[PDB]
Amino acid sequence: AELFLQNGLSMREFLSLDILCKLYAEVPGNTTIKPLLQKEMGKRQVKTIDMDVVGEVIEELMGDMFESYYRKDGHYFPLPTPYLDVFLWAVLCNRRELARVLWEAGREPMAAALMASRLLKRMASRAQEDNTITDISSDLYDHARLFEERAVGVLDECFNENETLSQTLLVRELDHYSRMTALELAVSAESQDFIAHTSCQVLLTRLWMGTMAMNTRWWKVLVCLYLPVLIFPIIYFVPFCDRIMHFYSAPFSKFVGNVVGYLAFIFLYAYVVLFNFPRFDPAKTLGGIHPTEIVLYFWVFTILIEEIRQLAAKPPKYIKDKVSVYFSDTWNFVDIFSLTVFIIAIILRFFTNSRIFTASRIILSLDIIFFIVRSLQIFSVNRLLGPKLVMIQKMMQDLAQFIIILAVFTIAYGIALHAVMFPSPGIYARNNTWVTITSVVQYPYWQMYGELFLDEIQGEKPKEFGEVDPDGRWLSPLLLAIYMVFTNILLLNLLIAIFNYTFERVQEDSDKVWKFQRYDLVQEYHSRPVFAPPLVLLGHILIFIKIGLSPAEMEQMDNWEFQAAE
Amino acid sequence: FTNSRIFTASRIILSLDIIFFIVRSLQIFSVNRLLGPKLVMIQKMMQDLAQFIIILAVFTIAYGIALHAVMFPSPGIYARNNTWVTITSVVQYPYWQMYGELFLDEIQGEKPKEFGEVDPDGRWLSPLLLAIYMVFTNILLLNLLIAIFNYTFERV
Amino acid sequence: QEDNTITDISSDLYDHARLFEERAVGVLDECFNENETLSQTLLVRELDHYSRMTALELAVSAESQDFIAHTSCQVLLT
Ligand SMILES: *[C@@H]1O[C@H](CO)[C@@H](O[C@@H]2O[C@H](CO)[C@@H](O)[C@H](O)[C@H]2NC(C)=O)[C@H](O)[C@H]1NC(C)=O
Ligand SMILES: *[C@@H]1O[C@H](CO)[C@@H](O[C@@H]2O[C@H](CO)[C@@H](O)[C@H](O)[C@H]2NC(C)=O)[C@H](O)[C@H]1NC(C)=O
Ligand SMILES: [Ca+2]
């Protein structure tokens, strides 16, 4: 194929629509793409293959509201991109050297390599999670890593001459890739080697220090954030109210504003739940509500209008697609959960019942935890702290996996221990279903942390624990001996070993995963209102009341990118 | 100065400054091939602890705000009518629970004299919150910090 | 590494610094393999073209642990 392309043949004259549909027709059978295409043709009841089925497979196999160009262009119902779609065919078929040749022969190469990496590793996940598809997943991850390092090398050769061209090449509209950039193609692909490259990181620093000097510290931004008249001496700009609006346009300034006003919010929420959250009564003024709780209502309404703004400012047009893009990160799950739990608590605020207000204060006092879980994204600005947060997230995945084994042994020993201490048809009966079930759950759990109930389970302390059966009084130390040698020593250190394996896997790439989540931090603070940190709701009022280039400039971009690829 | 508070501050400051003289003593152990590298390990692990302490304090103060807010509702009969014991309880009780000193008799409403009258709906919720805090902090966060220390140990 | 206005080429710079570390260690080793007393008196010279500081002081400014852990520097420190 390479020899044909470099002796007498061009893809522009060779490939047509029927050759391409036939090329997707005689895929061999040991691939992932034949089960995917036959599953999609089973969903449409069409016996022949066309490019709309291939396009829908590519759209569900890229994700993130990707729109494949076979569905929108009339040439797929000469061809515009013959190198690109024969390349995509060779990538879907898991053909190493053929996709290499078609990548080397085609235009927009790092975008092609990042799309190939996303497509191959999402085929790897698809073959791993489906039993009707042959698990060739390690081959697909190796091929995706091969396109990862090809994209990183093309970016590196672009970076070794005229870095400004690299920064403006990473943010191009790519009309043959559903109008998304190389940054967005890389973070869809989770290509951590591409984002941790120096070009993407200085670009995220330019976007992060938006029209402002790249080494201005956080305390200068802090003292200029609440004193705008002091912006003019010390804030250095990379080129009047132009300097003011360019100071507040920085996502780092919006970040420091979110940090300081959020610490004010957490201190206010803590003052409410720890010092003043009274029972509602219509007798005294304002219902008895302290105005710190009113300012609390104001700032959580501000966070709610903030999340409604983030839902409305999503790049798709349909509201369901905006919701699907909005819930693509877990931070929006934490946001919607904390806001909904707050709104439930403040609905239950006003009912004057003792149980309903008790539920309200309990729900609010447990929702401070979820606001501080939302606070955890702030620590991703630090090279040292953010990887530890990624460690915490993957260890919580490990804990949610191990917790069924831990609960199985815990409930087994709890059933045994409570059955030998408290025989229920006897004088030693706990005549209460709830304290029996919570004892089975509770007592092995606290014994698991070395809080040994040795006085309790041997028959002493009969008032606050219970009258233990006298033959449970000698058997309970033996059962607790087996449980301590099996659970505190073996099971817990097994879980610690799982956590340490997770620690080593993240710590060997901690720098690169911080570089990758730095993109998510920049995108989190790039779309915030350009406004005062106590007045961001006024900013949402004043909202209520990725670059494109010239076509000859785009062809010049493509020529420079293709020769750096050469 | 013969004042009771000023002399108390003097003896407290002297009795805490013996610690810093013995921190200065730590350079003597660099004459040993075996001990001095362990002191370099202690120094880099204290750097690691000073980095991890903001994450540990964030989760500690979160659970402390939650725990003290469910045990002691401040506009109620179960109010701790003292700002200082509230703030030091939020700092203090998750910290000692983090080392397995579980205040299970205290947070379930028993020992009302030296701990405080716990609200009866905090008496069942405090073991659940402490369960989540023990499975998240003594198991996950502390062994994460131990893993950081072990990575530092291997590097040195 | 600590400045954002400077391109982070830091790993290349640490590799180049380690390259000069092992070059210095090898020159000290070839100095040590004949007449060790000359190595000890060479490590403590006034170096007027280096602001009058020794090879020991240039190495501990550089934190060149491979140079100080060489046998010449250690018997000199003994
Ligand atoms: C739980 O209920 C059982 C059932 O009545 C109690 O068992 C009785 O206890 C008395 C004195 O303790 C004996 O005289 C009876 O013979 C027991 N009945 C049976 C069927 O064994 C038991 O004491 C209760 N336990 C608690 C803690 O309330
Ligand atoms: C803290 O102060 C509050 C405010 O007075 C006390 O709450 C009162 O307690 C008495 C009896 O305990 C009740 O009769 C009142 O109705 C309560 N007032 C309110 C507004 O709820 C509370 O007892 C004090 N707690 C401590 C430990 O001193
Ligand atoms: Ca959000």
Side-chain angles (χ1 to χ4, degrees):
Chain A
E2 183 178 1
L3 191 66
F4 292 159
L5 290 174
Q6 70 187 356
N7 281 120
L9 178 60
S10 66
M11 282 293 177
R12 181 69 65 189
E13 294 179 352
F14 169 71
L15 187 71
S16 64
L17 192 149
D18 55 354
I19 298 171
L20 184 64
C21 294
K22 178 174 66 176
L23 192 66
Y24 283 97
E26 278 91 7
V27 295
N30 55 3
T31 60
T32 305
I33 191 60
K34 180 180 285 294
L36 291 175
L37 287 172
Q38 288 178 356
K39 184 178 182 293
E40 185 61 41
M41 289 184 286
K43 289 176 71 68
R44 292 180 65 185
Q45 291 86 19
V46 177
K47 66 180 182 179
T48 186
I49 187 67
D50 56 352
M51 300 312 297
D52 192 74
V53 176
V54 175
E56 189 169 358
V57 170
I58 289 170
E59 284 178 353
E60 69 184 3
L61 198 60
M62 289 294 292
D64 295 330
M65 298 300 165
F66 184 79
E67 300 295 327
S68 182
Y69 61 92
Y70 310 117
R71 184 174 293 278
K72 277 80 179 174
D73 195 1
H75 294 88
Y76 297 99
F77 289 161
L79 297 182
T81 62
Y83 292 97
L84 177 60
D85 58 5
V86 180
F87 170 71
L88 290 174
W89 176 70
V91 167
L92 287 173
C93 293
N94 196 3
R95 299 188 183 187
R96 298 290 183 92
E97 298 292 327
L98 183 63
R100 181 181 66 84
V101 168
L102 294 161
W103 181 70
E104 293 180 354
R107 294 292 189 272
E108 291 177 352
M110 69 175 73
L114 289 170
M115 182 179 178
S117 175
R118 173 64 173 175
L119 195 66
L120 285 162
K121 70 179 69 175
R122 191 166 170 90
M123 283 186 281
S125 65
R126 180 67 178 171
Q128 187 177 2
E129 72 185 1
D130 195 2
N131 290 318
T132 61
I133 298 170
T134 299
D135 186 74
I136 54 171
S137 298
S138 295
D139 195 2
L140 292 167
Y141 288 119
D142 194 3
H143 200 189
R145 189 264 303 161
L146 186 61
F147 281 105
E148 282 178 352
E149 61 90 19
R150 287 172 187 173
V152 171
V154 173
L155 181 61
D156 187 75
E157 187 66 28
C158 288
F159 184 75
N160 288 319
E161 64 271 11
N162 201 354
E163 302 175 354
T164 306
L165 294 174
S166 300
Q167 275 75 246
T168 192
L169 183 65
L170 289 170
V171 292
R172 288 181 64 193
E173 293 290 334
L174 295 172
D175 295 331
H176 300 164
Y177 295 94
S178 74
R179 281 84 63 194
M180 69 193 290
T181 63
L183 293 175
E184 295 181 356
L185 285 172
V187 302
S188 67
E190 293 92 9
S191 180
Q192 292 180 356
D193 293 331
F194 195 83
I195 305 301
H197 188 270
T198 310
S199 180
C200 292
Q201 294 300 315
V202 300
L203 181 61
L204 288 173
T205 310
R206 297 287 175 87
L207 292 175
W208 179 252
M209 311 298 283
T211 313
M212 188 172 68
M214 299 170 74
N215 54 4
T216 59
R217 297 293 299 273
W218 63 271
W219 62 270
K220 293 172 71 175
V221 175
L222 173 57
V223 300
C224 295
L225 186 65
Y226 294 98
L227 294 175
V229 69
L230 200 144
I231 292 173
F232 293 157
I234 64 169
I235 296 299
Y236 291 161
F237 294 97
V238 289
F240 189 74
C241 295
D242 191 78
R243 293 180 185 268
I244 307 297
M245 293 296 106
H246 285 88
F247 180 77
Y248 290 103
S249 297
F252 180 69
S253 294
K254 297 174 180 179
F255 178 74
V256 175
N258 206 167
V259 169
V260 176
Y262 179 79
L263 287 174
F265 166 66
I266 295 301
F267 290 160
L268 188 66
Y269 199 97
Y271 181 75
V272 169
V273 301
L274 294 173
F275 290 100
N276 200 353
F277 185 70
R279 187 174 179 178
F280 182 75
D281 51 350
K284 63 179 73 66
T285 182
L286 198 61
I289 299 169
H290 195 271
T292 54
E293 184 177 357
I294 300 299
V295 178
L296 187 65
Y297 294 168
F298 183 76
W299 188 259
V300 186
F301 180 74
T302 300
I303 297 171
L304 182 62
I305 300 302
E306 169 66 32
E307 295 295 325
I308 292 169
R309 195 270 307 159
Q310 291 181 357
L311 178 61
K314 293 297 181 183
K317 185 258 290 182
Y318 292 100
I319 303 299
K320 182 178 183 292
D321 296 333
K322 289 181 185 293
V323 169
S324 179
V325 175
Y326 180 77
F327 290 101
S328 65
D329 53 354
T330 314
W331 299 102
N332 287 320
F333 287 102
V334 177
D335 279 322
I336 295 301
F337 184 75
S338 66
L339 290 170
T340 303
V341 166
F342 188 86
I343 290 169
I344 290 170
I346 301 307
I347 286 171
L348 297 176
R349 177 73 173 90
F350 294 98
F351 283 105
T352 314
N353 193 1
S354 180
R355 297 294 92 194
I356 296 171
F357 177 72
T358 299
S360 177
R361 61 172 175 84
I362 282 170
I363 282 170
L364 200 76
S365 299
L366 269 69
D367 190 62
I368 181 63
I369 298 170
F370 294 98
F371 280 118
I372 296 174
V373 170
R374 185 57 179 89
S375 74
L376 296 175
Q377 192 179 1
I378 287 170
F379 298 100
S380 65
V381 74
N382 207 167
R383 183 180 59 84
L384 299 166
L385 295 174
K388 308 300 182 291
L389 268 300
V390 176
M391 289 168 187
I392 290 167
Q393 192 268 333
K394 293 183 184 293
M395 287 174 190
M396 286 186 287
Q397 288 182 352
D398 291 330
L399 180 61
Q401 294 171 0
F402 184 76
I403 199 66
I404 189 64
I405 296 171
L406 191 146
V408 157
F409 290 113
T410 299
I411 294 302
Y413 171 71
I415 287 165
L417 185 66
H418 190 276
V420 301
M421 292 189 294
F422 294 97
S424 177
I427 62 169
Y428 296 101
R430 285 185 176 177
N431 292 311
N432 202 167
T433 302
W434 183 254
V435 306
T436 295
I437 296 173
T438 58
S439 295
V440 171
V441 176
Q442 182 180 2
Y443 292 148
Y445 185 80
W446 300 113
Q447 283 165 353
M448 186 180 75
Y449 296 103
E451 180 67 28
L452 299 169
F453 294 101
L454 292 177
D455 289 332
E456 285 82 358
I457 67 170
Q458 289 176 356
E460 293 86 5
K461 296 179 180 178
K463 301 294 186 290
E464 65 270 17
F465 182 76
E467 291 288 334
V468 180
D469 185 74
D471 289 326
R473 294 180 185 179
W474 62 269
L475 183 65
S476 297
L478 296 173
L479 292 175
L480 184 53
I482 301 169
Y483 180 73
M484 288 302 286
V485 74
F486 185 75
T487 303
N488 206 167
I489 296 176
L490 192 148
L491 292 173
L492 259 61
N493 294 308
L494 172 59
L495 181 57
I496 294 168
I498 298 162
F499 289 167
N500 291 320
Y501 181 72
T502 300
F503 179 78
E504 294 295 327
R505 290 182 294 171
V506 180
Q507 183 66 42
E508 66 185 2
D509 293 328
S510 66
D511 186 75
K512 292 182 182 292
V513 301
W514 179 67
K515 302 294 182 66
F516 184 74
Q517 66 186 352
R518 188 170 180 266
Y519 181 81
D520 291 332
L521 188 67
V522 171
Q523 292 299 109
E524 179 67 28
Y525 288 92
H526 187 272
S527 65
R528 300 292 185 90
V530 184
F531 286 100
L535 298 172
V536 287
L537 185 59
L538 188 148
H540 296 90
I541 297 299
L542 287 175
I543 290 170
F544 182 74
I545 299 298
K546 188 70 73 69
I547 62 169
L549 285 79
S550 296
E553 185 69 24
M554 285 175 69
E555 293 293 327
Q556 195 177 2
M557 283 285 111
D558 291 331
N559 289 319
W560 181 71
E561 187 185 0
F562 183 73
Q563 68 190 356
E566 287 177 352
Chain B
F1 283 105
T2 314
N3 193 1
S4 180
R5 297 294 92 194
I6 296 171
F7 177 72
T8 299
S10 177
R11 61 172 175 84
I12 282 170
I13 282 170
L14 200 76
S15 299
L16 269 69
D17 190 62
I18 181 63
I19 298 170
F20 294 98
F21 280 118
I22 296 174
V23 170
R24 185 57 179 89
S25 74
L26 296 175
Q27 192 179 1
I28 287 170
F29 298 100
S30 65
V31 74
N32 207 167
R33 183 180 59 84
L34 299 166
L35 295 174
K38 308 300 182 291
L39 268 300
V40 176
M41 289 168 187
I42 290 167
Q43 192 268 333
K44 293 183 184 293
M45 287 174 190
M46 286 186 287
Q47 288 182 352
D48 291 330
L49 180 61
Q51 294 171 0
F52 184 76
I53 199 66
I54 189 64
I55 296 171
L56 191 146
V58 157
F59 290 113
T60 299
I61 294 302
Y63 171 71
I65 287 165
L67 185 66
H68 190 276
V70 301
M71 292 189 294
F72 294 97
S74 177
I77 62 169
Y78 296 101
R80 285 185 176 177
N81 292 311
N82 202 167
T83 302
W84 183 254
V85 306
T86 295
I87 296 173
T88 58
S89 295
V90 171
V91 176
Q92 182 180 2
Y93 292 148
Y95 185 80
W96 300 113
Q97 283 165 353
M98 186 180 75
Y99 296 103
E101 180 67 28
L102 299 169
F103 294 101
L104 292 177
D105 289 332
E106 285 82 358
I107 67 170
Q108 289 176 356
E110 293 86 5
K111 296 179 180 178
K113 301 294 186 290
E114 65 270 17
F115 182 76
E117 291 288 334
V118 180
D119 185 74
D121 289 326
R123 294 180 185 179
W124 62 269
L125 183 65
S126 297
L128 296 173
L129 292 175
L130 184 53
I132 301 169
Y133 180 73
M134 288 302 286
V135 74
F136 185 75
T137 303
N138 206 167
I139 296 176
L140 192 148
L141 292 173
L142 259 61
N143 294 308
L144 172 59
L145 181 57
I146 294 168
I148 298 162
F149 289 167
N150 291 320
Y151 181 72
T152 300
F153 179 78
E154 294 295 327
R155 290 182 294 171
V156 180
Chain C
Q1 187 177 2
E2 72 185 1
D3 195 2
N4 290 318
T5 61
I6 298 170
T7 299
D8 186 74
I9 54 171
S10 298
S11 295
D12 195 2
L13 292 167
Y14 288 119
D15 194 3
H16 200 189
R18 189 264 303 161
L19 186 61
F20 281 105
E21 282 178 352
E22 61 90 19
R23 287 172 187 173
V25 171
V27 173
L28 181 61
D29 187 75
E30 187 66 28
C31 288
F32 184 75
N33 288 319
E34 64 271 11
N35 201 354
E36 302 175 354
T37 306
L38 294 174
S39 300
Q40 275 75 246
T41 192
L42 183 65
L43 289 170
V44 292
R45 288 181 64 193
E46 293 290 334
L47 295 172
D48 295 331
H49 300 164
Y50 295 94
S51 74
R52 281 84 63 194
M53 69 193 290
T54 63
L56 293 175
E57 295 181 356
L58 285 172
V60 302
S61 67
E63 293 92 9
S64 180
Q65 292 180 356
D66 293 331
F67 195 83
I68 305 301
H70 188 270
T71 310
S72 180
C73 292
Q74 294 301 315
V75 300
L76 181 61
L77 288 173
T78 310

